[PDB]
């Protein structure tokens, strides 16, 4: 029951957005429209008695530029022990809140279509103020007993200091969930320490997600409140909402539709997004895909679609933006 | 018919040049004298009906310093589909013009001996103003039908802006060729967008190559004109010529001789180069090799031999430079 695996995904696309921050269209070769491109090594070693040791080293691939800024293992770099008690992991990884709750996003938290809640709404100065991953992380995942399951993590700040914050990067968080196969629901809660403009700030996040797979189609949704609360007073609060559906089409095909709303209280502005996706499987490993998204900013909102490798910046206040990605995803 | 391959080459050498830009000799441990040192992963997946999906991730290795500046996949990072129609590749790679035409260089476009035509003659400000590789590349390669074959590529600029150039990095190019085994000939044409001193400039390149393998020996040659044409007027034009021969010696050995001329019109100066090479195969994977080169600059020319990892800068105007590399190439 021991093995070692070298694996990855190259997902590269052509992409277009009709406007950038100057109002000009952009198009080009981008990446990671259907799944994040990656390269990794992992293993499991059977130690006897149901105890296993694991490792996992994974970094993002950027096929449009050959990883010009250098390859790393920032997606995951863990060592773990697992057994009938669950699993304990040490190292950089998705924090438990994002690992579990991003599963409700039908666009796999990548490309132009996905839920944007896990983002740095306040221009926090920490390394991971999108709430997705943490350095210096220890996590514990329970088994699933009768559907119920939970995860918990703590990431050490190691006295990282920015301005009046001397614990930048601390994470404490976890979730409780129910997963029985067709039905899934989770509640996550997390706090990170950060700074905004050099002033100590808490990043507080509460997230609820649920889905039901009817077989002929799946319904999924997310609700999140993210609040950056500055110690001396003041807060940047965002409420993010998403509902989506996916369905198999003709064997080999899949259609996806997601709607999202981002209510950015600090600028009293909303943005709305609608994304349509299609995936056509040539094999279990190889798919062609297309995404089409429409993002409507109101008032002072300046959110932009995330066409990785082409354009992922903002747009002018109150502008609507259209984006398209067409590509190929190849897993190995 | 599916597979995955982890592969590479470590080619490390001792090297010497008798002068640098100050007129002093340099010697040391360098790399990539016979083949470029590399590490890569590639795969082919049989999809049925003659259709295949591929990936290829490859970066250069620098064995003298342990890749001190960080490992990347800048040599190639593609995903592809191939079939009876030919092959389409997405991602950073050699552009079709260089991929095909560099095959005529008997020194494998590496070390002190190779053809220097694919270089940044004008101090263009783009990432790839040597015309070798491009970011954001899509390429199409035909099958070989009755000898005839062709390749075409387009690389997106993605509005990269330097001074008055707002399409830096664009490539459009291709070749037509005839290859029947012993005889090979190709004509390549390409244009890149760039800037020189912040002023928009086209990099235009036309290249002809041919070779014939007699078995007892092979004759090969290249002719190229590279013109950097500035939009407001003015141009830096270089005509590059090479003729070479190689022959097996005693089973296990190979001797190579190449002569080149670089006519640098913007400085009204020529440089001439003669390189002798020997390769001694210990196995199909492992070879010992030696290169000896003599580069004569005339007038204002300051070209230097490319002893990678020891010295690859220029020399004083009108100086002649001698270089030597002795090393080992090990493929895996």
């Amino acid at each position: 029951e021991s093995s070692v695996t070298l694996f990855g995904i190259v997902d590269t696309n052509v992409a277009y957005v009709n406007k950038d921050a100057a109002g000009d269209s952009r198009y080009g070769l981008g990446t990671s429209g259907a799944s994040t491109s990656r390269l990794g090594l992992r293993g499991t070693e059977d130690l006897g008695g149901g105890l296993k040791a694991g490792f996992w080293l994974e970094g993002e691939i950027f096929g449009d530029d050959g990883n010009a800024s250098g390859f790393n293992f920032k997606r995951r770099s863990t060592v773990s022990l697992s057994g009938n008690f669950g699993e304990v992991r040490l190292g950089r990884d998705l924090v438990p809140t994002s690992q579990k709750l991003t599963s409700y996003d039908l666009f796999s938290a990548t490309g132009i279509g996905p839920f944007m809640g896990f983002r740095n709404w306040a221009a926090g100065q920490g390394a991971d103020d999108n709430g997705i991953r943490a350095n210096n992380l220890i996590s514990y995942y329970t088994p699933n007993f009768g559907g119920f399951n939970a995860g918990f993590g703590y990431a050490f700040d190691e006295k990282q200091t920015i301005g009046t914050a001397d614990s930048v990067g601390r994470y404490i968080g976890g979730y409780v969930a129910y997963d029985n196969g067709p039905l899934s629901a989770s509640l996550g809660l997390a706090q990170q320490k950060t700074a905004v403009g050099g002033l100590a700030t808490d990043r507080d996040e509460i997230t609820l997600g649920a889905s039901y797979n009817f077989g002929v189609a799946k319904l999924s949704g997310l609700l999140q409140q993210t609040k950056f609360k500055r110690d001396i007073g003041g807060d940047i609060k965002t409420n993010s909402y998403m509902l989506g559906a996916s369905a198999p089409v003709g064997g080999v095909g899949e259609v996806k539709l997601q709607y999202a709303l981002y209510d950015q209280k600090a600028i009293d502005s909303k943005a709305h997004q609608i994304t349509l996706g299609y995936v056509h499987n040539l094999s279990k490993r190889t798919a062609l895909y297309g995404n089409l998204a429409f993002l409507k900013n109101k008032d002072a909102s300046t959110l932009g679609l995330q066409a990785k490798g082409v354009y992922a910046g903002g747009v002018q206040a109150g502008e609507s933006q259209t984006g398209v990605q067409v590509g190929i995803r190849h897993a190995f | 018919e599916s597979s995955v391959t982890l592969f590479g080459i470590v080619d490390t050498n001792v090297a010497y040049v008798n002068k640098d830009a100050a007129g002093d000799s340099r010697y040391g441990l360098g790399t990539s004298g016979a083949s470029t040192s590399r590490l890569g992963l590639r795969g082919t997946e049989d999809l049925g009906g003659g259709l295949k999906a591929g990936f290829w991730l490859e970066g250069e290795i620098f064995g003298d310093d342990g890749n001190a500046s960080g490992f990347n996949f800048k040599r190639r990072s593609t995903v592809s589909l191939s079939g009876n129609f030919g092959e389409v590749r997405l991602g950073r790679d050699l552009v079709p013009t260089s991929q095909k035409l560099t095959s005529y260089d008997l020194f494998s476009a590496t070390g002190i001996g190779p053809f220097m035509g694919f270089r940044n003659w004008a101090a263009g400000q783009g990432a790839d103003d040597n015309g070798i590789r491009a970011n954001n590349l899509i390429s199409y390669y035909t099958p070989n039908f009755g000898g005839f074959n062709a390749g075409f590529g387009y690389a997106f600029d993605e509005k990269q802006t330097i001074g008055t150039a707002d399409s830096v990095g664009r490539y459009i190019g291709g070749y037509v060729a005839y290859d029947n085994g012993p005889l090979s000939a190709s004509l390549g044409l390409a244009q890149q967008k760039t800037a020189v001193g912040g002023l928009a400039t086209d990099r235009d390149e036309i290249t002809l190559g041919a070779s014939y393998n007699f078995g007892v020996a092979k004759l090969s040659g290249l002719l190229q004109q590279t013109k950097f044409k500035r939009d407001i007027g003015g141009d830096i034009k270089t005509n590059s010529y090479m003729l070479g021969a190689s022959a097996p010696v005693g089973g296990v050995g190979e001797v190579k001789l190449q002569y080149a001329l670089y006519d640098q019109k913007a400085i009204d100066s020529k440089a001439h180069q003669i390189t002798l090479g020997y390769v001694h195969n210990l196995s199909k994977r492992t070879a010992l090799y030696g290169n000896l080169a003599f580069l004569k600059n005339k007038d204002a020319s300051t070209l230097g031999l490319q002893a990678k990892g020891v010295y690859a800068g220029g020399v004083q105007a009108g100086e002649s430079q001698t270089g030597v590399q002795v090393g080992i190439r090990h493929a895996f």
């Binding site: 070692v4 695996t5 070298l6 694996f7 490993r285 897993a331 | 795969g43």
Partner: peptide, 8 residues
């Protein structure tokens, strides 16, 4: 152990 691909 021999190194396997992602799909085993």
């Amino acid at each position: 152990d021999n190194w396997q691909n992602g799909t085993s």
